[PDB]
Amino acid sequence: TPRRWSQEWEVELAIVLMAKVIELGGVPTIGDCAVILRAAIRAPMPSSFLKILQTTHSLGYAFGSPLYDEIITLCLDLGELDAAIAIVADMETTGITVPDQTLDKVISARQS
Amino acid sequence: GRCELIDEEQAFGVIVDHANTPDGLSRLLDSVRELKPRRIITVIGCAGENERGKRPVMTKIATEKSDVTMLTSDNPGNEDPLDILDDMLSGIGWTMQEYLKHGEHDYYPPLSNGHRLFLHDVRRVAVRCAVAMGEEGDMVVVAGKGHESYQLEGDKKEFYDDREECREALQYVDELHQAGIDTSEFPWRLPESH
Amino acid sequence: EVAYATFENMEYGEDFMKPDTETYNWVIQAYTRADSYDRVQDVAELLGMMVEDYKRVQPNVKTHALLVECFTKYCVVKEAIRHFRALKNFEGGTKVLHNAGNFEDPLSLYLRALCREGRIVELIDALDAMRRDNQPIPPRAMIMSRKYRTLVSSWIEPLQEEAELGYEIDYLARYVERKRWVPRRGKTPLDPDAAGFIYSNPIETSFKQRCLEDWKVHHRKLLRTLQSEGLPVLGDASESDYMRVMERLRNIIKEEVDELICRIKLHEGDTEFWKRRFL
Amino acid sequence: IDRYKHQQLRIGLVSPQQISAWARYQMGYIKLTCPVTHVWYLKRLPSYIANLLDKPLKELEGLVYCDFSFARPITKKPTFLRQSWKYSIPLFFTTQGFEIFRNREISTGAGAIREQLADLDLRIIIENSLVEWKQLGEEGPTGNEWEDRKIVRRKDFLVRRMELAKHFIRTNIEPEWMVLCLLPVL
Amino acid sequence: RILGIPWGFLIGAELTIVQSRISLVNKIQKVYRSQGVQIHNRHIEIIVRQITSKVLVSEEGMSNVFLPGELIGLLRAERTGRALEEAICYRAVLLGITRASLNTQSFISEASFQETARVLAKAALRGRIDWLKGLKENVVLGGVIPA
Amino acid sequence: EVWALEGFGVAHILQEMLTYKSAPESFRLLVRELRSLALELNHFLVSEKNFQINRKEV
């Protein structure tokens, strides 16, 4: 019996395939990373964001700040504050700017 | 000259200009927008074989600054006019195939800003359709030549002028609406088409 | 034809001149690289003859590689995946199928076929097989549309619409790259550079669409079995349950009943069932 | 062991280039003023040109056997335009442009067949025909014999169209040669 | 139904074709025998081998290998049914004499027999290759007869 | 008679009777009339030694 499609399964397979292609010396584009990111955002899944951003940053890309705003606001809507601050720390160690109008959510992620 | 008004009676402005580069057309659309037209229609074209880079850039101008724009041939030389149009369309992520498919789908969609983008290789028809797009208080800019009396298209340069193509046309373009040719969008909605 | 004439000389000759595995390889290569006509039926005939020779001929690496070449140059991917899944077991099989990157590139054509047909659960297996061989991705596999998508994402549900990148696209910079997209008057060449196939690449289908199609096809086969075997394929059920489950199948093609659908078996695989039905 | 005598015959439609190349001793040609359909491919059923274009045979007969019919625009080039305005447009347009675009926008006679057939995307024909055959196969059989046999004839038509287009994309010939522009002379 | 899609078509063709061969050899030779005009079966069996040579791919046999309505030899159908999973399906056909010709690959043997314009039209659209073998298609070309 | 001669396999007599006793010029006529119907009846033979596609004189 074939497994039914799911957005989570599609994203997990996309991440695995992107890892394999990176191993094999391919180069995913900024567009491919943005599409995998958007597919993760279309699922209610937080854990994919860490992998996708770590990968795309290791490829040397950067998304524009509105995508990080979308990510962090969705992560807060999920309540995944530890994932949000991890993504922020990974941006900071990548050297990607996190403007204050996006960092306010991350300082307020230490309300408790 | 510059911003050269069609010296004929018209319900909406039509002006003709030499602007054939981004530097010319940017200041052209600035000047015409300062008049606050109800809508602006832009016709523009690029010579062939020369200054490749500018071709999509002027598109990026027009498609952001002109509520309608109508790309067409001008002096394409040995380059196919459709190649020039595809180079222009690349500036907003359309290919020639997107345009032609939407042609077969009878509906050229609006751009991300809600403006519309059209083309035709035959400059005479493109410019006269553009002036046929006009409504009371609209404006049209047709740019690229100003005073060049010829098309350098293919093996030859052949007699043609934008102004003398438009001047008399502004007095019979209303016969389109009299004959029921609904020009409110570029795939003209002729009620029976028969 | 000039190769098949020698093959027909051998296959109907004395035992000392009967085809071996290499003879089949060379004639399959002759057909799969023919210039001017469709050879799929001939390649399938030759394969069937090779299977008919099972007492004498067994396949090798090059045989499976040539068959994957055939079943991917022509859009026959449901058989290509099977021959590649056999090729996996031979070391350097993907090197052979890469064929040093000439005669187009059968490995790249295969990866593209799996991409556009959304067979990603096979595509990751092809990539792992290449990894085991240390075969790199050919550049020919990373072809993109004018919307920059690769096999890494071109099967994710928005097939040809790019995601938001957080900024406007730098169209004026991407123009610097000629690959104009004007559709020419009809002729043998192709406009999309992905279409190195004989007829054309597979129709662009998402992983969702491919999964949904496979689900439909599986349930349609289950319904065909249910309506051919009859109620005894459930056994301890009512004909009312049989009618209900037929309606459920027909619906999902277009609760206990799902457990009944779990109980109906299929025997598409091992012939040991059919080789007993025949008795 | 076998002496491997190999020889083969190929029959095929001839290009107009070959027609110009004609020039039991000699051959000649006529410069046709208008394209002309090959009667074996328009008329003699099943209509092969109709099987390519997916038009009813009555429509292709209309376009050249009837005294009045009109083609839609030809697919590969921009067009906008689609009483009858027959005179009016040659007033709204100069004839120097009108005669350039009109045949692109609307045409009649076998030239319409020639141009539409040369514009034909023989591959998207395969994709569309497979998609429609799949649709007609997943659609359930009807209880009406006339509708059922119509569906079956449609499936058969799509299969014939796939076969013809597949051969035209896998042979060194072109479908627009089904309409002649030069006629040979004995 | 009984043998399923991998084998039911193949053995159904086999049983149909062998039954047909037996029936045709009987019904044909019974005439000659009852008329007393004796003939050896090996002459009838070549004709009956041609009449029963093909099968047709049905609609459920739609594939990228074979299209529906395509006529393929029984050996081709058996071998591809063993080899491929590509939705192969076929049914035996009793190709009458006047349809075994006009389905004989050497297009000259078709055109010089009957329906000449229709044969030539199809074959020219198909760009068909008559790889010259057999006799009827060789005497037109004034050859040495591949026999 | 063609059927009988080719039944005997006596095919050089058949060739004589059908060609030089009166490609053969009648096959030239056949190809020329089809070529006049705008069909290229094209005759090739393949070199067994060199695979060269020699076009026959037609």
From TrEMBL, chain D:
Entry protein name: DNA-directed RNA polymerase subunit beta'
In the UniProt record, the gene name given for this protein reads: rpoC1
Q: According to its UniProt entry, what is the function of this protein?
A: DNA-dependent RNA polymerase catalyzes the transcription of DNA into RNA using the four ribonucleoside triphosphates as substrates.
Covered residues, full protein: 2 to 272 of 680
Which family does the record assign?
Answer: Belongs to the RNA polymerase beta' chain family. RpoC1 subfamily.
Subcellular localization is given as: Plastid, Chloroplast
Quaternary structure annotation from Swiss-Prot or TrEMBL = In plastids the minimal PEP RNA polymerase catalytic core is composed of four subunits: alpha, beta, beta', and beta''. When a (nuclear-encoded) sigma factor is associated with the core the holoenzyme is formed, which can initiate transcription.
**Organism in which the protein naturally occurs:** Sinapis alba
Q: Output the superkingdom of the source species.
A: Eukaryota
Automatic annotation (TrEMBL), chain E:
Q: How does it assemble?
A: In plastids the minimal PEP RNA polymerase catalytic core is composed of four subunits: alpha, beta, beta', and beta''. When a (nuclear-encoded) sigma factor is associated with the core the holoenzyme is formed, which can initiate transcription.
Q: Which organism is it from?
A: Sinapis alba
Q: Under what name is this protein listed?
A: DNA-directed RNA polymerase subunit beta''
Please give the superkingdom of this protein's source: Eukaryota
Coding gene? rpoC2
Q: Where is the signal peptide?
A: none
**What is this protein's function?**
DNA-dependent RNA polymerase catalyzes the transcription of DNA into RNA using the four ribonucleoside triphosphates as substrates.
The record's similarity note reads: Belongs to the RNA polymerase beta' chain family. RpoC2 subfamily.
**Which part of the chain is the RNA polymerase Rpb1 domain?**
16-102
Q: Where in the cell is it found?
A: Plastid, Chloroplast
Automatic annotation (TrEMBL), chain F:
Location relative to the cell:
Plastid, Chloroplast
| Species of origin | Sinapis alba
Q: Which domain of life is it from?
A: Eukaryota
Q: What is this protein called?
A: DNA-directed RNA polymerase subunit beta
Membrane-crossing ranges are: none
What exactly does this protein do?
Answer: DNA-dependent RNA polymerase catalyzes the transcription of DNA into RNA using the four ribonucleoside triphosphates as substrates.
To which protein family does this belong? Belongs to the RNA polymerase beta chain family.
**Summary of subunit composition and partner proteins:** In plastids the minimal PEP RNA polymerase catalytic core is composed of four subunits: alpha, beta, beta', and beta''. When a (nuclear-encoded) sigma factor is associated with the core the holoenzyme is formed, which can initiate transcription.
